[PDB]
């Protein structure tokens, strides 16, 4: 007794309503956005890359890295559903399973431990936990992981900033602001290292 | 086979809703704004040019450099469609192609390779790659190219500032901030060389 067609449409329209929530919480969008935010503030440029471009890059990146799970949903939950092979209730479960598996690969056991105790449910295996518990654990792990990557990328720009300030202080020109002179070198290092292609490749490879 | 009048209208309104995205992700708007962002940051003025006029000049600059491609879209796609020479499906493809060609002229081979492997698809010719994968490669190349131009624009202003600081220190006045003295000199040398006209030539002509 699968859900009637009227209820099936009502469920799907509700999922489209929560589409921003699914992208910003259940996907890779948050980690990429935060790492780009740290990198932008690491250099002297405040909002030169602009917010729309940063989100635009992240949206394409989060679509590419989640193409495997997106295809797995299609090949196991959409095509059998359209071919009249699985109950609509079964198809919904078949779509949710790869999404849960992907979120578990990028989560930390400490995050699961605190939220499982917070929910107060007696579950032992770290695979049959509810989405209500998994999603906050996943987004917490993504924020912490983004900070680690953000600190990693920040260090070389801190090195340049300290060197420029030290060299200027060596000549006794303490009045000269190190930030104005430091910025072209920060652009210099990031461009001869091929930073933009490098960071997006690492962010793509990070989700594994 | 061809889309009905009702459906064609729906597609037209949809592209108008996404019009800001097409400007800042497919056209030359991103490179111009980033380069102009460096120019404002290089000089001692922080918000003095203000954000409004920079975007407005960038929009007019884009319409100038996109005029060949926009006219090519007009001739190849709009004119047969208005005269009812071709169907809506092929007219849409005839409009998409000039945009794809322009994005290929402003991208790099390495950037395309990274994203085509990232998408996990099969292709052998760059000319028939999907626009969904071309867009992230296009802007990534645009950001790297803009940083290169901005770095070159930042050097002469760094040159002027370092000279003024050295002169003041050499004269013995270790108490005066170089920024106040250097700012008129940076502005004077920006005007008597007609700096913006030179930047227009190296920015508008950089696409070709």
């Amino acid at each position: 007794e699968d859900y009637s067609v009227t209820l099936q449409i009502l469920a799907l329209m509700t999922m489209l309503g929560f589409l921003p929530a699914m992208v910003i919480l259940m996907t890779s969008f948050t980690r990429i956005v935060v790492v780009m935010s740290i990198l932008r503030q690491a250099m002297g440029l405040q909002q030169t890359p602009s917010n729309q471009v940063i989100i635009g890059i992240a949206l394409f990146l989060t679509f590419f890295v989640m193409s495997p799970v997106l295809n797995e949903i299609n090949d196991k939950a959409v095509q059998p559903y359209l071919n009249e092979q699985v109950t609509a209730r079964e198809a919904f479960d078949a779509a949710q399973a790869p999404m849960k598996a992907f979120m578990l690969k990028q989560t930390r056991i400490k995050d699961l431990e605190t939220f499982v105790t917070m929910s107060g449910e007696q579950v032992d295996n770290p695979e049959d936990v509810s989405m209500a518990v998994l999603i906050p654990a996943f987004i917490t792990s993504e924020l912490k992981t983004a900070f680690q990557i953000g600190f990693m990328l920040f260090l070389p720009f801190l090195i340049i900033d300290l060197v420029v300030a030290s060299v200027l202080m060596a000549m006794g020109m303490m009045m000269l602001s190190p930030m104005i002179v430091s910025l072209p070198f920060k652009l210099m290092l990031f461009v001869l290292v091929d930073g933009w292609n490098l960071i997006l490749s690492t962010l793509a490879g990070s989700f594994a | 086979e061809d889309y009905s009048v009702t459906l064609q209208i729906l597609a037209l309104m949809t592209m108008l809703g996404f019009l800001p995205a097409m400007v800042i992700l497919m056209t030359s708007f991103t490179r111009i704004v980033v380069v102009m962002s460096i120019l404002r940051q290089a000089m001692g003025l922080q918000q003095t040019p203000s954000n409004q006029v920079i975007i407005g000049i960038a929009l007019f600059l884009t319409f100038f450099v996109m005029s060949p491609v926009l006219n090519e879209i007009n001739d190849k796609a709009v004119q047969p469609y208005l005269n009812e020479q071709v169907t809506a499906r092929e007219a849409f493809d005839a409009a998409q192609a000039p945009m794809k060609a322009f994005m290929l002229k402003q991208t790099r081979i390495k950037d395309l390779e990274t994203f085509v492997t990232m998408s996990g698809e099969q292709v052998d010719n760059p000319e028939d790659v999907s626009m969904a994968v071309l867009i992230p490669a296009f802007i990534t190349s645009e950001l790297k190219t803009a940083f290169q131009i901005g770095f070159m624009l930042f050097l002469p202003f760094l040159i002027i500032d370092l000279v003024v600081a050295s002169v003041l220190m050499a004269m013995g006045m270790m108490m005066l901030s170089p920024m106040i003295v250097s700012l008129p000199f940076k502005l004077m040398l920006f005007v008597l060389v007609d700096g913006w006209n030179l930047i227009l030539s190296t920015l508008a002509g950089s696409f070709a």
Binding site: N71, N74 | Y3, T6, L7
Partner: peptide, 21 residues
């Protein structure tokens, strides 16, 4: 695949409109 999902949906709507007209 998933990309063709949107293409198929639009074609069905176009076919339904074409038959209705």
């Amino acid at each position: 695949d998933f990309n063709d999902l949107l293409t198929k949906a639009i074609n069905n709507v176009n076919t339904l409109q074409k038959a209705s007209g």
